[PDB]
Design a protein around this nucleic acid. Structure first.
Ligand code: CL
Ligand code: CL
Ligand code: MG
Ligand code: MG
Ligand code: MG
Ligand code: MG
Ligand code: MG
Ligand code: MG
Ligand code: MG
Ligand code: MG
Ligand code: MG
Ligand code: MG
Ligand code: MG
Ligand code: MG
Ligand code: MG
Ligand code: MG
Ligand code: MG
Ligand code: MG
Ligand code: MG
Ligand code: MG
Ligand code: MG
Ligand code: MG
Ligand code: MG
Ligand code: MG
Ligand code: MG
Ligand code: MG
Lengths: 99, 189
RNA sequence: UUGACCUCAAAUCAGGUAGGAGUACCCGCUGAACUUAAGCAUAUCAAUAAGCGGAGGAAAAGAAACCAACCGGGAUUGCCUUAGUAACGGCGAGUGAAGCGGCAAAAGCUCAAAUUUGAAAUCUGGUACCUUCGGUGCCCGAGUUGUAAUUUGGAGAGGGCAACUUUGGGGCCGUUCCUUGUCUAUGUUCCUUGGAACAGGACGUCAUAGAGGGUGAGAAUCCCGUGUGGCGAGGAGUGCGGUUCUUUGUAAAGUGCCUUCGAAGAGUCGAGUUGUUUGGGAAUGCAGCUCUAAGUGGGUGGUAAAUUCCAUCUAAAGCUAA
RNA sequence: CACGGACCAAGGAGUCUAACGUCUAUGCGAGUGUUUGGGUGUAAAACCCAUACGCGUAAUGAAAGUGAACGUAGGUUGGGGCCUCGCAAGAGGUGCACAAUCGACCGAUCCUGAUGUCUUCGGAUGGAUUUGAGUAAGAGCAUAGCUGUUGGGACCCGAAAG
RNA sequence: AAAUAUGUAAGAAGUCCUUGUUACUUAAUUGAACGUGGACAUUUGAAUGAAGAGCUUUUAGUGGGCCAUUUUUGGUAAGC
């Protein structure tokens, strides 16, 4: 990550003696904690599953995980959120009846 | 409406602009008000210098990065290296900025030196209240000015290695442009 | 039967509070057309006038879910500039910001989410007394469906080790400021004109006072004032210059090192669609309806999409002078 | 035999502003502009000043980008003035500004494709009835004035409407 | 096939003698174009005139016309 010392190119810019700033605690805002993991797991057992999550599980078993992502994209927003949701359903399927 | 050889003009006066005309008749009056306000503030704050000490930082952007100017406040790391806490620094006349970070050793060392020189040039009156009467200096920026760091010596020996600066710049542009396509061809093979 | 709890009522019950006015400037809602385009419907006039709701001496904004792509900057507001520029536009008429740079002014912060659990440690009211913008004792009540202490991401917390550093709350006298009173120089001496000398002429005086006004015509010196100083009277604000009464306290705060941890806001973000708006252009903000998340997550990075990286902040809670 | 005018007094119509074209005056000049602001003051005056910023000093492409001397900064024709000779008339020399023309240089476009290669990069060299608001010993910046331009009630008074 | 109108020329940026350049042109130093050097002065190439000639910037008003002689179209003609 050292600059070349010239005005153009991949690593353009002046070369200065580098320092490592101390990490900022605000950069860990979305980090799971032991207390938070316990509450979320307990709530899932109590509340159960959403109606759109029930039909996603059926599509995974009957029509594969590719069509599940297409439906999950529709109910949710971005396609990147559909990837995570389908992944969670697969873990639920593994721990529901497979094992 | 359009005649003769004249430049095209764009004068934006198709709204009710006359209702929003501001003439600064009080330019001289406000200068007196500001000078009066500064004088009465100096008398209120004892011998305090009316302004806080500021660090030296590099201006952003390629256009202005050749200069140093005054920043908002010293970082937590700079304050700690000077040998005091941030809370005490605020009450002693030093500006502290928690969101600025240190990544350059030259800037960090210079701001450490400014804090050390500031501490050796001030007198802190005790909380007892005896309060010896010292003369008030109205500015800390003038007492501790900011100078552009030195860059190079006046004269030096010519060292030419036979390379071309123009060729070096051209090759640097070429490498960046075709880096993506070269990697794809290498990966596909 | 009797006694609680929950929810919902009544009283000319005890104590309070809101309305209306003003509205130059300030925070929102709602919302035109004349006009310009040499016609005209998008556009423009204009996110304006009229209409409605709500404040203060300022309001609002404000301690980054920012700007950036640099050797990075660092709450907000305003001025100079960026710039009639990027961009929008029957790409016509027209419209039109922002980052950097100089300057004025500078100020920082706190809740929710943790068991005080060897002791709800908190608070309204009533009553008696007192040093009365409040204090103390006692008694009901509120409150565990959570009131205090402790901790707000810059961190920080629970244990272990070794160390030093620093006080709090009132009287009185002065100062600072404002509202006021009083004192503090020198010709009306002669001649002419005139109803009137404050005019003309001669000879003097004061001046840190020859600003202004009055008095029978142009008055420094006739009167009030003006200039420079002195001496009083009544309050506000504790900003502080000295003195004086209380030890607050087995109280509070800061700093080194080891280890285990490190809770951070949901019909919300985001997405589709419709309308409106913006310079914001595969859509800038706002709102309705439908769908509706995550926790190495989430937002942003000004061309839609898939894949791989990087940078930068920490939303959906709150206060704050110039 | 078109319209206004019975009479008199007073009032009664090209203004100011933002941004500009030409010309002229003034200061300085490859620079120029003190007045956002600071200092200072006999206090809205006068006097003094740092850093920036604007314009100018480089152009040309949609853009990535590249970027102005073969030579006394070229040749030729015409040129005021000056120089030499001459009584003069003239002849010769040198010739700024300016006018015409042929070249050279920089960018764009269309071609040629050397030494060398992350074998596709690199683009040397030499051309073309093509093209530019360019270079070729800088001229601009600021203030002021008449005249002209555009937006503004816009020289003054006047609709039927909305 | 007129009259009246109308283009060009009447010199120095001209004529002549000699010979330099080129990637154009010729069978060819042939030609073309542009030049070096030499010769010819203002009866220097007809007339008359010439409040001097050349050149640049900027801007006002105007963009309803009408009449007479001659030529001439429509119309019986018209102050059409
Ligand atoms: Cl669109
Ligand atoms: Cl280009
Ligand atoms: Mg952060
Ligand atoms: Mg009552
Ligand atoms: Mg408002
Ligand atoms: Mg129109
Ligand atoms: Mg019209
Ligand atoms: Mg109309
Ligand atoms: Mg209104
Ligand atoms: Mg009030
Ligand atoms: Mg104020
Ligand atoms: Mg406020
Ligand atoms: Mg914060
Ligand atoms: Mg800022
Ligand atoms: Mg608009
Ligand atoms: Mg609306
Ligand atoms: Mg567009
Ligand atoms: Mg787009
Ligand atoms: Mg607020
Ligand atoms: Mg008429
Ligand atoms: Mg009449
Ligand atoms: Mg008159
Ligand atoms: Mg008049
Ligand atoms: Mg005028
Ligand atoms: Mg209409
Ligand atoms: Mg006309």
């Amino acid at each position: 990550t050292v600059k070349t010392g010239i005005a153009i190119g991949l690593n353009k810019g002046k070369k200065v003696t580098s320092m490592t700033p101390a990490p900022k605690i605000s950069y860990k805002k979305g980090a799971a904690s032991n207390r938070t993991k316990f509450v979320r797991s307990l709530v899932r057992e109590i509340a159960g599953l959403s109606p759109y999550e029930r039909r996603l599980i059926d599509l995974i078993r009957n029509s594969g995980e590719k069509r599940a992502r297409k439906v999950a994209k529709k109910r949710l927003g971005s396609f990147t959120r559909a990837k995570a949701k389908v992944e969670e359903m697969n873990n639920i399927i593994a721990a529901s009846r497979r094992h | 409406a359009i005649s003769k050889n004249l430049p095209i003009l764009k004068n934006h006066f198709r709204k009710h602009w006359q209702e929003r005309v501001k003439v600064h008749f009080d330019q001289a009056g406000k200068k007196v008000s500001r000078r009066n306000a500064r004088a009465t503030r100096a008398a209120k704050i004892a011998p305090r210098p009316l302004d806080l000490l500021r660090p030296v930082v590099r201006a952003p952007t390629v256009k202005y990065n050749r200069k140093v100017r005054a920043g908002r406040g010293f970082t937590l790391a700079e304050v700690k290296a000077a040998g005091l806490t941030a809370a005490y620094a605020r009450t002693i006349g030093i500006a502290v900025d928690h969101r600025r970070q240190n990544r350059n050793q030259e800037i960090f060392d210079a701001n450490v030196q400014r804090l050390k020189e500031y501490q050796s040039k001030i007198i802190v009156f005790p909380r007892n209240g005896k309060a010896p009467e010292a003369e008030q200096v109205l500015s800390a920026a003038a007492t501790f000015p900011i100078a552009q760091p030195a860059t190079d010596v006046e004269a030096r020996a010519v060292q030419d290695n036979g390379e071309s600066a123009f060729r070096t710049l051209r090759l640097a542009r070429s490498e960046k442009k075709f880096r993506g396509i070269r990697e794809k061809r290498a990966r596909e093979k």
